[PDB]
Design a binder for this molecule. Structure first.
Ligand SMILES: [Cl-]
Ligand SMILES: [Cl-]
Ligand SMILES: [Cl-]
Ligand SMILES: [Cl-]
Ligand SMILES: [K+]
Ligand SMILES: [Mg+2]
Ligand SMILES: [Mg+2]
Ligand SMILES: [Mg+2]
Ligand SMILES: [Mg+2]
Ligand SMILES: [Mg+2]
Ligand SMILES: [Mg+2]
Ligand SMILES: [Mg+2]
Ligand SMILES: [Mg+2]
Ligand SMILES: [Mg+2]
Ligand SMILES: [Mg+2]
Ligand SMILES: [Mg+2]
Ligand SMILES: [Mg+2]
Ligand SMILES: [Mg+2]
Ligand SMILES: [Mg+2]
Ligand SMILES: [Mg+2]
Ligand SMILES: [Mg+2]
Ligand SMILES: [Mg+2]
Ligand SMILES: [Mg+2]
Ligand SMILES: [Mg+2]
Ligand SMILES: [Mg+2]
Ligand code: NA
Ligand code: NA
Ligand code: NA
Ligand code: NA
Ligand code: NA
Ligand code: NA
Ligand code: NA
Ligand code: NA
Ligand code: NA
Ligand code: NA
Lengths: 237, 194, 92, 56
RNA sequence: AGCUUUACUGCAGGCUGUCGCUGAGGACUCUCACUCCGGGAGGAGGACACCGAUAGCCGGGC
RNA sequence: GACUCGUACGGUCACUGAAUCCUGCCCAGUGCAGGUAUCUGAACACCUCGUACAAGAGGACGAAGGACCUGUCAACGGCGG
RNA sequence: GAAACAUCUCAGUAUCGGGAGGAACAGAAAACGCAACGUGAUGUCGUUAGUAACCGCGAGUGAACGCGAUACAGCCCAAAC
């Protein structure tokens, strides 16, 4: 047969790449020798093409201009702070240690100083729960309990743009426009609609998968399709 | 009496014990951060170098080369192949790493010529060899009765034609009798069967 | 069929009739050092191994008689042609 | 649209041109590589053994 | 010839044990290689992982 | 190296195919996944035999996997005499 | 090709990568082993011989020592001091 679509993906051709050259900023937390002296003022609220959520343009005392992962509430004029001593209000960023338990946080770091990794999608937010001299348990938006180094920096508040998922796309055109600004090939042709040569589900005089859909984790690329290492399927039971 | 050299040599008979061990555990840290080919002012194994033709004089150069450990880095077949030729994993190359090292070095010094080379250890994923090269054009060598031979036109790119010592051993030319029927005078003259 | 564990018959060694004892030939064990054992290791490589890639064939409906005839006098055994027999049991 | 005659009409693009090195009209002005002598790709001149019968 | 599969035989790939890198005091501590985060100070991890070698299993992805 | 100037309101892999009323029963087989007293399960090292060595024979230990058990059908499919 | 075909064969061929010279390569024994009280660097030619050896012991594959010739040529380091 021929390589399946998932295999064409990896090659990184234009079709599968994201329009990076059209992206505004690689949102990442600022650095500070220490102290926390850093602070700036929101100048504008822009649209971020890579996340379909707003990003805030901020100006710091050291005249540094950078875009930030805008939580909800932040407006132009507002002043934000970054450091071990920053205030405990929405928009400010400080290590999990200096953050009071029970406070919604976003754009959490996985490794202190990595600039943020977790919870940075529209409306989501993490939840700092347990403190310690070593571990800072945080509940990520997926429900998992992530144990983290208390030195990992994070932003207070929930990410802006919440509720985006509530309104349906309604029409293909709308999807089309969104998909065009992402690293994704769209629309999607069903495997079962292809020829055997093209996909393990292809072929037949009627459309149905050849074998069962749940595939072993050990399956090789070219054959891993359908329900990957499913612990279960269906809704029942 | 023993020579000073004899001690360097005796220490390298067991690069895993004694001071040499502690020494390697150290150097390699720096080596793993160096390039593919690093010219070095002095041979790490003086006895070996001199023994192999080295000589503290103008026109004599030395460089340490690192090559990855393991079998061939081969691509699987993209057309019809009988089961015999469908291999990838177990296939190994017919030139030993030391010979690969000599070549990468010689290519780094286009004007020089490989005189010899020797192993200086290996970590878990690579091997290091120090190659002794010679400037066939420097008069300091054109006048050396022990090395001027390398200046002859027919010694040009000698490493790429397997005229090196490691080259000739890898070509199965060590034995002069039994077992060397398909090797001498040359692999190619013997229909490539060695 | 039934068969006497012992009985008189010609002993090719003594050149005279003696009382022999019948026993079923127990398979000897392999050394794994015969020439064929070496060639298997030698010749087996990447991909199909030719003959060494085959697997044992089936069986015949009935096997022949695989017996050793031991001479009670000189204690030496001898072999004979066998004969198809679904089952063979010795009497005593 | 026919892949034949009707698709011939759009062919007004220039690719292969006289080669500064070998003089053959094989210099792909978009690739900046000569399909004939390999100029632009190789310092050595393009030549393969299959350009003639194996025993010649 | 293309295609399929619980056809024959193999080949990638995945999982797994073992050896090398690899070090100090059947479960455990450690730091020094090695890995990663950090501009750096330095933080996390740590003889594991990665990588090289081998063995068993799965293996029409080829 | 793509995904990714991305981080679960994400994006990957599949099935179905707007709305509306709905979507029953079956986990035996096959698939996937979880577990597992016990059984099975390669090589290195280890023990025994063997060989002044070696080939080789046997043992002990036993990973994933399998047996066995469980979950799962908007998983492949099934819904008769 | 093996009257299929997988080892084998085609064949280390076709083709690809790198490089020298007017020739290249080889070369002064940790050789040979007509076992000797023998030969004496290396290529090459004739022979040894379709012999020994390999091989679903199938089809096929296939040397060497020696011998007769051609031409002959033997040296330099490392170390000891
Ligand atoms: Cl979407
Ligand atoms: Cl050279
Ligand atoms: Cl019997
Ligand atoms: Cl002789
Ligand atoms: K063939
Ligand atoms: Mg696109
Ligand atoms: Mg980023
Ligand atoms: Mg949706
Ligand atoms: Mg579709
Ligand atoms: Mg169709
Ligand atoms: Mg297929
Ligand atoms: Mg349908
Ligand atoms: Mg269907
Ligand atoms: Mg020749
Ligand atoms: Mg095999
Ligand atoms: Mg056409
Ligand atoms: Mg056919
Ligand atoms: Mg990095
Ligand atoms: Mg097939
Ligand atoms: Mg449709
Ligand atoms: Mg045939
Ligand atoms: Mg036949
Ligand atoms: Mg042959
Ligand atoms: Mg001989
Ligand atoms: Mg002298
Ligand atoms: Na189908
Ligand atoms: Na050179
Ligand atoms: Na050979
Ligand atoms: Na062999
Ligand atoms: Na076809
Ligand atoms: Na079932
Ligand atoms: Na089941
Ligand atoms: Na035929
Ligand atoms: Na055929
Ligand atoms: Na064969």
């Amino acid at each position: 047969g021929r390589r399946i679509q998932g295999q064409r993906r990896g090659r990184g051709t234009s079709t599968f790449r994201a329009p990076s050259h059209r992206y505004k900023a690689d949102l990442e937390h600022r650095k500070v020798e220490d102290g926390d002296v850093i602070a700036g003022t929101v100048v504008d609220i822009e649209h971020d093409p890579a996340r379909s959520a707003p990003v805030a343009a901020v100006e710091f005392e050291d005249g540094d201009r950078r875009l930030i992962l805008a939580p909800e509430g932040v407006g132009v004029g507002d002043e934000l702070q970054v450091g071990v001593s920053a205030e405990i209000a929405p928009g400010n960023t400080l290590p999990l240690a200096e953050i009071p338990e029970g406070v919604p946080v976003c754009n959490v770091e996985s490794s202190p100083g990595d600039g943020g990794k977790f919870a940075r999608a529209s409306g989501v937010n993490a939840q700092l729960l347990t403190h310690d001299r070593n571990v800072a348990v945080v509940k990520l938006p997926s429900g998992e309990m992530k144990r983290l180094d208390p030195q990992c920096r994070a932003t207070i508040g929930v990410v802006a743009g919440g509720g985006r998922t509530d309104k349906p796309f309604v029409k293909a055109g709308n999807k089309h426009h969104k998909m065009k600004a992402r690293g994704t090939k769209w629309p999607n042709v069903r495997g079962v609609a292809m020829n055997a040569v093209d996909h393990p589900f292809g072929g037949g005089g009627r459309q149905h998968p050849g074998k069962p859909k749940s595939i072993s984790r050990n399956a090789p690329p070219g054959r891993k399709v359908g329900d990957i290492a499913s612990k279960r399927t269906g809704r029942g039971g | 009496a023993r020579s000073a050299y004899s001690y360097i040599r005796d220490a390298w008979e067991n690069p895993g014990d004694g001071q040499l061990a502690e020494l390697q555990w150290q150097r390699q840290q720096e080596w793993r951060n160096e390039g593919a080919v690093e010219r070095i002012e002095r041979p790490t194994r003086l006895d070996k170098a001199r023994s192999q033709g080295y000589k503290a004089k103008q026109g004599v150069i030395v460089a340490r080369v690192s090559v990855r450990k393991g079998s061939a880095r081969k691509r699987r077949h993209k057309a019809g192949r009988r089961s015999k030729r469908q291999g990838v994993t177990r296939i190994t190359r017919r030139k030993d790493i030391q010979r690969v090292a000599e070549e990468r070095a010689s290519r780094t010094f286009p004007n020089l010529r490989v005189l010899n080379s020797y192993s200086v250890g290996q970590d878990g994923r690579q091997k290091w060899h120090e190659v002794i090269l010679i400037d066939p054009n420097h008069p300091a060598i054109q006048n050396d009765d022990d090395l001027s031979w390398i200046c002859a036109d027919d010694q040009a790119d000698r490493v790429f034609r397997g005229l090196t010592g490691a080259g000739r051993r890898n070509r199965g030319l060590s034995g002069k009798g039994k077992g060397s029927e398909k090797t001498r005078p040359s692999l190619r003259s013997n229909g490539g069967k060695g | 069929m039934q068969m006497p564990r012992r009985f008189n018959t010609y002993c090719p060694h003594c050149n005279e009739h003696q009382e022999h004892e019948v026993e079923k030939v127990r398979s000897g064990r392999q050394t794994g050092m015969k020439w064929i054992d070496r060639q298997r290791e030698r010749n087996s490589g990447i991909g199909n191994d030719g003959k060494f890639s085959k697997v044992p064939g089936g069986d015949k409906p009935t096997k022949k008689t695989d017996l050793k005839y031991r001479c009670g006098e000189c204690g030496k055994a001898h072999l004979r042609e066998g004969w198809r027999a679904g089952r063979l049991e010795f009497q005593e | 649209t026919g892949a034949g005659t009707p698709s011939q009409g759009k062919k007004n693009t220039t690719t292969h041109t006289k080669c500064r090195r070998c003089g053959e009209k094989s210099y792909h002005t978009k690739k900046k590589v000569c399909s004939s002598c390999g100029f632009g790709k190789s310092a050595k001149r393009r030549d393969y053994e299959w350009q003639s019968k194996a025993g010649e």
